Amino acid sequence: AAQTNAPWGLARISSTSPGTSTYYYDESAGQGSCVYVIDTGIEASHPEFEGRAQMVKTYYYSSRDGNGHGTHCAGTVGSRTYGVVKKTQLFGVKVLDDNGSGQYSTIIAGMDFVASDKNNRNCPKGVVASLSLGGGYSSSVNSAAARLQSSGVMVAVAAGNNNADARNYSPASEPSVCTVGASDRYDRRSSFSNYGSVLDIFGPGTSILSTWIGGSTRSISGTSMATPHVAGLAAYLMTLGKTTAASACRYIADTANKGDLSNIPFGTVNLLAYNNYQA
């Protein structure tokens, strides 16, 4: 299938070369899969989710996304125009407040929440959890991400935006999950992207067009933006049967565009998520 004049990153993911504008993907588009967007919530009623999104747990007073980061993330994961997987099921776990912050215990609880909740949802092709969030090194956060991962959910996590070694960096440094760095339109590592040996792959993260609150759209940048492209790609690939939750990260790395990024430090992988679509 093809989406003409798609946002650049959608085009990037289904291209071996930068500069293209069509996003080519398989029409299954993530249906059957579920992606838990652990964030600020999602504006489920946004027309772009076409009813495929829903809030499942909030740790706040409202289930509402009064931020947009979440809706933004949910959108690159699976809104109709801006998402990697146009037919995926989105579940919103508001572990983040309307300002984008929150506590490790609430983020860790959201994660245990999902590891349990997936058991009462119908996600025939797999469950992904996209975590466009992080903070400083925490063995408990790491740990929660590793339990989530081990409960059978593909954990995609932002590398972070400090232009530093993600080793610092939680859940980013939990070696069992998938640590997502960010890239720009020209194939360069995103100026803000974390790097290092715990990264597993890179996705488009520079000025990414997605859904916003209020029923609108907005382009923003970040490893938070690259994460969902890969959580979206994991969900797409899982619905395709190419991989499983447990080996989806490894499979995205093995099928990536290699050696294409520039500005990749020695020790960091030079791998770009690629859907490998063939018409």
Partner: peptide, 4 residues
Amino acid sequence: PAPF
């Protein structure tokens, strides 16, 4: 710290 938080979203990322």
